[PDB]
């Protein structure tokens, strides 16, 4: 069953990534940003900045070396300012990408090579494992996780007073369907007969609120009585 659900999950991953073209947007725009920034840099070439013309040669081919240096000064001032703005922009986004890379490496060390108890650090649900995949300038994780479904209603109590003694579950919870009492683990319905072996005794039953009367099963008693 787990195998078939896993296969179905992988197939829907393939189909969902093949169908929706809008999933990879985080990988797209950054690339676009670079080109856009680069583009406007070359678009700053033909700005006159209040000087006579945007060609260096035409200023040189028409004006005098006692005169033209004012125009050249204007040109280099404007272009230099644009270039310094560019390096500021790129270096800030570089810091941003460094932040993302550190986050990705931490997810590499915790989701893949181990099994993290931190909720939603390895995707939604109870984490089981993950696999990495390479991507253009980036990484794509697949988190394989566990979720519950088909819950029901059950009636509970904190502890059970059998013989003047309080009984607490070793691991799990006491439940009742209305007629009998069972003990089960906290994430999957699996009732068991309430024994000594899955419980423990601590104190009497005159302090705990909400404690009910029931029997506990002695494993030793049918062995001792039949002998």
């Amino acid at each position: 069953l787990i195998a078939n659900q896993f296969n179905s999950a992988i197939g829907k991953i393939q189909d969902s990534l093949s169908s929706t073209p809008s999933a990879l947007g985080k990988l797209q725009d950054v690339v676009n940003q670079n080109a856009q920034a680069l583009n406007t840099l070359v678009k700053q070439l033909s700005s006159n900045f209040g000087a006579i013309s945007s060609v260096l040669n035409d200023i040189l081919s028409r004006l005098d070396p006692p005169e033209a240096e004012v125009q050249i000064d204007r040109l280099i001032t404007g272009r230099l300012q644009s270039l310094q703005t560019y390096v500021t922009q790129q270096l800030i986004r570089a810091a941003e990408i460094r932040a993302s890379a550190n986050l990705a490496a931490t997810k590499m060390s915790e989701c893949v090579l181990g099994q993290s108890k931190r909720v939603d650090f390895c995707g939604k649900g109870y984490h089981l494992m993950s696999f990495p995949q390479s991507a253009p300038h980036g990484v794509v994780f697949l988190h394989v996780t566990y979720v519950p479904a088909q819950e029901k209603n059950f009636t509970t109590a904190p502890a059970i007073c059998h013989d003047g003694k309080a009984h607490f579950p070793r691991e799990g919870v006491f439940v009742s369907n209305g007629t009998h009492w069972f003990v089960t683990q906290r994430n999957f319905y699996e009732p068991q007969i309430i024994t000594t072996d899955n419980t423990f005794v601590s104190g009497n039953c005159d302090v705990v609120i909400g404690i009910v009367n029931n029997t506990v099963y002695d494993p030793l008693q049918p062995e001792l009585d039949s002998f």
Binding site: Q5, S100, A104, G138, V139, V140, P148, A149, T156, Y189
Partner: peptide, 20 residues
Amino acid sequence: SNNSIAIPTNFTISVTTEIL
């Protein structure tokens, strides 16, 4: 309630994707 517990019986393996 003070005496009501909800316990699941069935489960699902599900795989999600995440891009960095």
